[PDB]
Amino acid sequence: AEYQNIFSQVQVRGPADLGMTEDVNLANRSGVGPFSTLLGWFGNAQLGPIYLGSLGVLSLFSGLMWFFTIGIWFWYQAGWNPAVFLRDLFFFSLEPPAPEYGLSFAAPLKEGGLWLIASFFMFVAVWSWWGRTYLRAQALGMGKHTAWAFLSAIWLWMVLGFIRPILMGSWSEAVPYGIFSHLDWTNNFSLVHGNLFYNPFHGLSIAFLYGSALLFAMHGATILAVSRFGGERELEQIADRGTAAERAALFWRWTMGFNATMEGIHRWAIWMAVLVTLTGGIGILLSGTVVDNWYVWGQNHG
Amino acid sequence: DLASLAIYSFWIFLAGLIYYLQTENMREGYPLENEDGTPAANQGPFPLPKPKTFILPHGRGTLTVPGPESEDRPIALARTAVSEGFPHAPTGDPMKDGVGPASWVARRDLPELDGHGHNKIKPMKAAAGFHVSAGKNPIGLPVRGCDLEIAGKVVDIWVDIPEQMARFLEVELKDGSTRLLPMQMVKVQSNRVHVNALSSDLFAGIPTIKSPTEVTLLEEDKICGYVAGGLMYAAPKRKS
Amino acid sequence: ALLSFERKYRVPGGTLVGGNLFDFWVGPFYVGFFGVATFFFAALGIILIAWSAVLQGTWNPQLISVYPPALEYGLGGAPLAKGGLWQIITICATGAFVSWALREVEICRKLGIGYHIPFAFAFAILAYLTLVLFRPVMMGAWGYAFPYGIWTHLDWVSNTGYTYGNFHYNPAHMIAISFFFTNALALALHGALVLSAANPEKGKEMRTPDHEDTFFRDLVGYSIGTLGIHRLGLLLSLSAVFFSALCMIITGTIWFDQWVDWWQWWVKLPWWANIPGGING
Numbered sequence: 001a002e003y004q005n006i007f008s009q010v011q012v013r014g015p016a017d018l019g020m021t022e023d024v025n026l027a028n029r030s031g032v033g034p035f036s037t038l039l040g041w042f043g044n045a046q047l048g049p050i051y052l053g054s055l056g057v058l059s060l061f062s063g064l065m066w067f068f069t070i071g072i073w074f075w076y077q078a079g080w081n082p083a084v085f086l087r088d089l090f091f092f093s094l095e096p097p098a099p100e101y102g103l104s105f106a107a108p109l110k111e112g113g114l115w116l117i118a119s120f121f122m123f124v125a126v127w128s129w130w131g132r133t134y135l136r137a138q139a140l141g142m143g144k145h146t147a148w149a150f151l152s153a154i155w156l157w158m159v160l161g162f163i164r165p166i167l168m169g170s171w172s173e174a175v176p177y178g179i180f181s182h183l184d185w186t187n188n189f190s191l192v193h194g195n196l197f198y199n200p201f202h203g204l205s206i207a208f209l210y211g212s213a214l215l216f217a218m219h220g221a222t223i224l225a226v227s228r229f230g231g232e233r234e235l236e237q238i239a240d241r242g243t244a245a246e247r248a249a250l251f252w253r254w255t256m257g258f259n260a261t262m263e264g265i266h267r268w269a270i271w272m273a274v275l276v277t278l279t280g281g282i283g284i285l286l287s288g289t290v291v292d293n294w295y296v297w298g299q300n301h302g
Numbered sequence: 303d304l305a306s307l308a309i310y311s312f313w314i315f316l317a318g319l320i321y322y323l324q325t326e327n328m329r330e331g332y333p334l335e336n337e338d339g340t341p342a343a344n345q346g347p348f349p350l351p352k353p354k355t356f357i358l359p360h361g362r363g364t365l366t367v368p369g370p371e372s373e374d375r376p377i378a379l380a381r382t383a384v385s386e387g388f389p390h391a392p393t394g395d396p397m398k399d400g401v402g403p404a405s406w407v408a409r410r411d412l413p414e415l416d417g418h419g420h421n422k423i424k425p426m427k428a429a430a431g432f433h434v435s436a437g438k439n440p441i442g443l444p445v446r447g448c449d450l451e452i453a454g455k456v457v458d459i460w461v462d463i464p465e466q467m468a469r470f471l472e473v474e475l476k477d478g479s480t481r482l483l484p485m486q487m488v489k490v491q492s493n494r495v496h497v498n499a500l501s502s503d504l505f506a507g508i509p510t511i512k513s514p515t516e517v518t519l520l521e522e523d524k525i526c527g528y529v530a531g532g533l534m535y536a537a538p539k540r541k542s
Numbered sequence: 543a544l545l546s547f548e549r550k551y552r553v554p555g556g557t558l559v560g561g562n563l564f565d566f567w568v569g570p571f572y573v574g575f576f577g578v579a580t581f582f583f584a585a586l587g588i589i590l591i592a593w594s595a596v597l598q599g600t601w602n603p604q605l606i607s608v609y610p611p612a613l614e615y616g617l618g619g620a621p622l623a624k625g626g627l628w629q630i631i632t633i634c635a636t637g638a639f640v641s642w643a644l645r646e647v648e649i650c651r652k653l654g655i656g657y658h659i660p661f662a663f664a665f666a667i668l669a670y671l672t673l674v675l676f677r678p679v680m681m682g683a684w685g686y687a688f689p690y691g692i693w694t695h696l697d698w699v700s701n702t703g704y705t706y707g708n709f710h711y712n713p714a715h716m717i718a719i720s721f722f723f724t725n726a727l728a729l730a731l732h733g734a735l736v737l738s739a740a741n742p743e744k745g746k747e748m749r750t751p752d753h754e755d756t757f758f759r760d761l762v763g764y765s766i767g768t769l770g771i772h773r774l775g776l777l778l779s780l781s782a783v784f785f786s787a788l789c790m791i792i793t794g795t796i797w798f799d800q801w802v803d804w805w806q807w808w809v810k811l812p813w814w815a816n817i818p819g820g821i822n823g
């Protein structure tokens with residue numbers, strides 16, 4: 001039948017795009033990477049350049065440091081055997097110190113000190129990386145939205161590994177590094193709190209998560225439907241509305257009786273998404289600190 | 303409770319968020335109108351927001367919304383009923399008139415500029431050093447309409463420079479003038495480019511660009527408008 | 543009432559069924575054949591749910607709940623008050639959804655746009671039908687479906703889950719969840735990016751797609767592009783749901799034991815099954 005625009009029919013390459021300059025220190029930008037023809041059926045072909053700079057280097061270092069601390073401990077758990085390592089890969093786990101130690105850095109390396117180390121490396125890697133999302137926008141003249149939205153993710157993560165453990169008086173309240181074991185932590189957490197289905201922030205978090213999938217499907221499908229009038233050119237459509245912006249609005253108005261603007265839909269979006277981790281952060285933070293059991297809490301509607 | 307307080311507060315916040323969100327998306331299209339263009343009576347519970355001003359780069363000026371709304375163009379439609387809410391029949395040829403699925407907005411009559419202030423879309427021939435990098439190269443393929451007649455031949459690809467992607471096929475007509483066809487409305491095949499929306503005899507009807515090495519926001523809308531409308535209005539000559 | 547640019551688009555045409563019979567609006571809502579169909583199904587549906595709420599003996603909305611026929615009824619019918627209402631309501635729901643998608647198609651046609659939306663919606667619809675048609679039929683009973691109630695459906699989820707142990711270990715569930723999380727991360731990024739470009743630092747001019755591409759490459763060394771990101775969101779979202787339905791179509795049919803256990807195919811591979819050391823030896 002028709003052509004649907006999920007993949008391109010023809011790619012065109014020109015000279016490597018080195019991006020807008022603005023107030024960026026081009027000393028710190030790399031040069032271009034390869035060009036993936038494979039990627040280009042779907043999105044851009046061009047890899048790179050990437051801006052490094054010292055905050056980057058810090059994050060990137062600290063991130064590998066985190067990662068390696070865990071891998072070393074996994075290798076060790078595999079008794080240095082390669083085949084065991086791959087076989088048991090999803091079973092290995094870097095657990096936090098025992099309740100014994102409360103919030104102290106007293107625990108032995110083999111019994112949770114190592115968890116605290118890998119955790120330190122992670123705390124550094126993430127926050128610097130956050131400062132990076134702010135700075136890269138500043139240097140470009142852009143809004144801080146991205147760093148704000150990222151903060152929403154940082155929130156839940158902070159709550160899980162840092163704020164909530166501290167408030168509970170022990171590092172053992174925290175999540176372990178390990179594929180299967182972190183799922184177990186998650187399941188257990190629910191059980192020990194009376195089922196998170198009874199936590200209303202979890203219920204909200206779910207709504208937004210499902211909602212994010214619904215929204216981005218709609219938005220995504222809408223832009224593609226109006227790509228035949230150049231809909232994907234969102235900023236120019238914002239500054240000078242075309243039939244694309246209009247046919248979009250109108251499909252939704254006729255369907256569900258109200259609609260968005262080419263800028264406003266993005267406000268819906270940034271919120272729908274940040275609200276996932278936001279509600280979720282609160283929900284978890286409240287658990288065990290204020291509410292010991294969500295079924296019970298729910299019996300008193302509060 | 304603390305948890306009760308937190309949940310109560312959230313719901314209140316949420317209500318305010320929805321308000322702010324709904325009103326933000328009323329920067330265009332509002333106030334509501336009657337079919338006659340006068341302000342409709344009931345606007346609903348949401349007010350208009352205080353306006354905002356976007357500064358366009360490259361001295362192109364500002365946009366301030368919400369602002370006074372109008373089509374700045376004739377609309378070849380007439381009512382088909384005595385009460386609100388029925389279709390409006392095209393007074394003329396809906397394709398030429400740019401109504402219905404053939405509708406175009408009176409956007410600015412300049413072209414979108416990349417970040418450097420250069421034209422964002424160029425014929426590939428004038429774009430250096432851009433070339434086809436993957437998939438069948440349409441250049442030189444005959445162009446076939448939904449009536450299965452050849453309507454012309456592809457004589458360049460117009461491309462988006464900052465985004466490096468195909469946006470139009472420039473097509474030569476029997477009379478040796480050209481037209482832009484939206485990339486998204488053609489099917490490049492091994493031995494031809496196929497266009498379902500238009501029958502061969504409506505190709506000449508495609509709006510034409512005033513300068514042959516740029517295209518303006520306005521001409522883009524007329525062109526994409528015109529071709530999309532083909533779907534509904536070339537239903538007579540299609541077939542297959 | 544019409545939006546300021548709306549009239550030019552409100553032309554005759556595009557309907558799938560019944561020509562110009564229902565080709566009209568009602569306020570902002572388009573009708574068409576499938577507008578009527580939708581209304582009918584949803585109305586019947588709501589009436590029936592309210593009937594069920596009378597038989598159950600409550601008007602509270604957090605307590606209303608419509609349960610499928612019990613497991614003994616199989617795939618046959620069941621007395622209205624003992625499952626048959628749910629059965630009819632389900633037929634109505636599907637009626638409403640498919641009609642809503644088809645009405646969406648008719649809109650597309652009047653508007654000369656792509657069909658992506660009702661194509662995407664179709665994925666939700668199929669998740670629904672998995673839960674209440676394809677799985678229950680393949681398992682032999684309507685009773686295996688979820689109940690129509692706000693809090694009781696959460697029990698069905700929770701009970702169904704723990705039947706297979708900690709459901710985390712279902713691998714399709716894993717892939718599904720990854721897509722959900724990723725999709726949400728991409729929603730946040732896209733939303734924030736566009737808005738960061740349209741709403742630059744006080745005084746500055748609107749940035750450009752070039753700034754957007756720059757920002758990403760600057761941050762992560764790649765940018766998918768403004769066509770790409772819309773292709774992505776749609777694909778993340780549809781894929782999440784695809785794998786959702788896939789994860790429950792297989793649970794209770796091609797796998798019915800503890801999901802955790804399924805993983806032992808890997809551990810018990812010949813080339814390492816017996817090597818001692820680590821978590822499994």
Ligand code: 2GO
Binds near residue numbers: 060062064129151274
């Ligand atoms: C609305 C909240 C939403 C939720 C859904 C969300 C969830 C998640 C999850 C999850 C669902 O669990 C994950 C896992 C997740 C992760 C991220 N989010 Zn996230 N996230 C969200 C929203 C956001 C937002 C706005 C942003 C992130 C941003 C980020 C960023 C944070 C980047 C960071 O912290 O990095 C520091 C450490 C690094 C980079 C080292 C990691 C080690 C790695 C395994 C090594 C392998 C590859 C090396 C880099 C190669 C080195 C080669 C060498 C030889 C040179 C990542 C992609 C961050 C970003 O950079 O995005 C590209 C950002 O701006 N996220 N995010």
Ligand code: 2GO
Binds near residue numbers: 202203214
């Ligand atoms: C998808 C996996 C599974 C299935 C069984 C399931 C299905 C459904 C359906 C369906 C297949 O038809 C519906 C309609 C549904 C609805 C809900 N579920 Zn639901 N639900 C599931 C699982 C869950 C889980 C874990 C959770 C919800 C929670 C919720 C919540 C929040 C869901 C949500 O936000 O989803 C994204 C959609 C958005 C944001 C659009 C708004 C939809 C609107 C709020 C739903 C209307 C609900 C009416 C009361 C339904 C009856 C109307 C009828 C009488 C005409 C509502 C009550 C939500 C909650 O807080 O529950 C009380 C929550 O935590 N759901 N849910």
Ligand code: 2GO
Binds near residue numbers: 188197206209283
């Ligand atoms: C037995 C499980 C039990 C049941 C009751 C349950 C069910 C469900 C269902 C269902 C039954 O169908 C659903 C749909 C559901 C959903 C949720 N539950 Zn849920 N849920 C349960 C239990 C839990 C638990 C403990 C938690 C959630 C939480 C949540 C929340 C989780 C929100 C979320 O998106 O979390 C992911 C994002 C995170 C964790 C942020 C991390 C970002 C960080 C800053 C980046 C770190 C990056 C590294 C450096 C790695 C670099 C990688 C490299 C590539 C560079 C979602 C909505 C989440 C939460 O917020 O809850 C309020 C959480 O902590 N859930 N949940």
Ligand code: 2GO
Binds near residue numbers: 583642659689690695
């Ligand atoms: C496929 C990816 C994604 C997923 C995540 C998705 C999820 C969900 C959930 C969820 C996560 O639980 C919900 C609740 C949901 C709901 C919607 N989606 Zn949805 N949805 C998605 C994608 C899409 C797409 C592209 C579209 C919708 C569209 C729609 C629309 C569909 C409106 C519609 O179909 O109207 C016809 C029927 C009506 C109005 C009433 C039906 C009455 C019925 C007979 C009685 C109720 C029967 C139920 C089974 C009761 C269950 C109650 C209990 C679980 C609480 C709504 C907002 C629809 C739309 O209009 O969007 C605003 C649309 O075009 N959705 N959607």
Ligand code: 2GO
Binds near residue numbers: 703789
């Ligand atoms: C104790 C429960 C256990 C735990 C371990 C668990 C955990 C988790 C977590 C976590 C953080 O621990 C997450 C994130 C998670 C997520 C998932 N699990 Zn999950 N999971 C568990 C168990 C289950 C069970 C039984 C199920 C899921 C299912 C799922 C699914 C849930 C999302 C989903 O499947 O969505 C499909 C959407 C549907 C069916 C909505 C259909 C909408 C319909 C077509 C239109 C409706 C229109 C309305 C009626 C309109 C009303 C009027 C309007 C005007 C408002 C995802 C993959 C879900 C599924 O895969 O659906 C096919 C499912 O059935 N899960 N799950």
Ligand SMILES: COC(C)(C)C/C=C/C(C)=C/C=C/C(C)=C/C=C/C(C)=C/C=C\C=C(C)\C=C\C=C(/C)CC/C=C(\C)CCC=C(C)C
Binds near residue numbers: 067071160161
């Ligand atoms: C191939 O092998 C090599 C050696 C090359 C490397 C391989 C490495 C491997 C196998 C790595 C595997 C890593 C895995 C499986 C990681 C799993 C990670 C998961 C699932 C993490 C999930 C959640 C983590 C959370 C929520 C952590 C939150 C942490 C914080 C919020 C930081 C808090 C900081 C603390 C407690 C330290 C405070 C200390 C000071 C000094 C301030």
Ligand SMILES: CCCCCCCCCCCC[N+](C)(C)[O-]
Binds near residue numbers: 202203204207271272
């Ligand atoms: C961007 C905002 C979109 C609003 C979506 C709100 C959905 C309502 C979900 C109800 C939550 C149920 N519960 C038990 C937590 O109260």
Ligand SMILES: CCCCCCCCCCCC[N+](C)(C)[O-]
Binds near residue numbers: 603606607608690692
């Ligand atoms: C199958 C469930 C039927 C749900 C009943 C009608 C939906 C209205 C939404 C619930 C509103 C709850 N509230 C605010 C009254 O408490």
Ligand SMILES: CCCCCCCCCCCC[N+](C)(C)[O-]
Binds near residue numbers: 717720721724
């Ligand atoms: C940013 C793109 C990331 C894509 C990853 C999505 C999570 C799914 C991971 C499992 C991959 C399995 N699959 C579907 C490709 O076959």
Ligand SMILES: [Fe+3]
Binds near residue numbers: 219266736
């Ligand atoms: Fe967008």
